[PDB]
Amino acid sequence: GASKLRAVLEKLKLSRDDISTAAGMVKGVVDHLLLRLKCDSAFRGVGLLNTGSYYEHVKISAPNEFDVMFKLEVPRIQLEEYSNTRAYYFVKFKRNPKENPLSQFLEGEILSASKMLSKFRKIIKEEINDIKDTDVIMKRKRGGSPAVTLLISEKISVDITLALESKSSWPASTQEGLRIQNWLSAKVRKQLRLKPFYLVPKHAQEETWRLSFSHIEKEILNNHGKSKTCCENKEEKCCRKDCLKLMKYLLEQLKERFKDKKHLDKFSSYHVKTAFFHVCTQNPQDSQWDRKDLGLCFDNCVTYFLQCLRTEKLENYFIPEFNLFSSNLIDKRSKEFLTKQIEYERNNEFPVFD
Ligand SMILES: Cn1nc(-c2ccc(F)cc2)cc1C(=O)O
Ligand SMILES: [Zn+2]
């Protein structure tokens, strides 16, 4: 029951905690990019999102794949929702010193993502060659975010996303989102909602940006209990983080198994992570997440995610009217394929964790 799950969580811990020079190679490459980008008119205010975090792993089993975010403070930003999408926006400016650092990317009153990504990719291309230390090659694929993919030596890949940062109130599409009031409290919601938000270049091909709150997600996960003391007693933690890891590895393993088929290509840890936050709101009490009940708690997540694929509904945790499971985003057959693969996993004591 929880035996296989515990063994899985223990191997994942050991693979994550093991000694590697990977993060060292990555830190040096990034610090180098940042110092080059800073002596440029457009990117003088560029910085790492979380200062101290380079080893940010989206994949729970990939210790050689890194995900880094470079944020750029955009003061006096004006947002205009694109085509009732709730999550995609045009970036405009209120403007007084109109010859602003980003004026070079303006296509009318509109901030071009394409023009900003071009300049950014170019400066990064210029710094990659100038490196005499390690073997770094700039892999380019169709995608606004991650803007860049670097490959340091073998297996060490780094995804770089450029993100605009806004320190203004969150867009109206978020007003009913982050329903943590009965779990984390109403005062925690007000405090997180006073924090900045990020816009990443992304299409739903227009010059649009997608809202990003992964820094709020990171804060929640490190202070996730109804009680302020949750997991401070290491002998009696809750199994919240474990259930999330297991949901991520389940999907990772199913994607690896069916990589030749194209059916699971559109699913990502983001879908499984969002579903897990919806189960947190559903089950707000720390007693609903006992370390002893790992198996049952994991089943609660599996069943809820399964309900989501079947009903074709998975709301974005921050933007309630953004449906991650819409038929225009992911077609029914792909969803039915995932439901079938997950149902087989549950009914065969998750063979993907063998
Ligand atoms: C599949 N997906 N959707 C998002 C998303 C992010 C912000 C939004 F407002 C809406 C959607 C991120 C991912 C991912 O990481 O795959
Ligand atoms: Zn806890």
Strand, coil or helix: 309: helix
Cited resolution, angstroms: 2.0
Contact 11, 304 (CB under 8 A): no
* Residues in binding site for ATP: 53, 65-67, 214-217, 248, 269-273
Technique used to solve these coordinates: X-ray
User: Contact, 276 vs 243, CB < 8 A?
Assistant: yes
Measured CA to CA, the distance from residue 112 to residue 277 in angstroms comes to 33
Residue with the smallest CA separation from ligand 1 atom 12 is 270
> Cβ < 6 Å from ligand 1: which residues?
87, 210-212, 268, 270, 316, 319, 322, 324
Yes or no: say if 216 and 195 are a contact pair by the CB < 8 Å rule. yes
CA-to-CA distance for 88 and 319, rounded, in angstroms?
Answer: 11
All structural domains of the chain with their residue ranges: 1-14+170-196+213-354, 15-169+197-212
> How many C-alpha atoms does 211 have within 13 Å on its Cβ side?
27
Residue 297, helix vs strand vs coil: helix
Assigned token pair, 7: 């063994």
- CA count, 13 A, side-chain hemisphere, 14: 6
Binding residues: 51, 53, 65-67, 159, 202, 210-217, 224, 230-231, 238, 248, 269-273
Distance of alpha carbon 241 from alpha carbon 276, whole angstroms = 10
Distance of alpha carbon 191 from alpha carbon 323, whole angstroms: 26
The C-alpha R_g of the chain, in whole angstroms, comes to 21
Helix (H, G, I), strand (E, B) or coil at 224: coil
Q: How far is the CA of 46 from the centre of ligand 2 (A)?
A: 34
* Pick from 140, 85, 89, 83: nearest CA to 111: 89
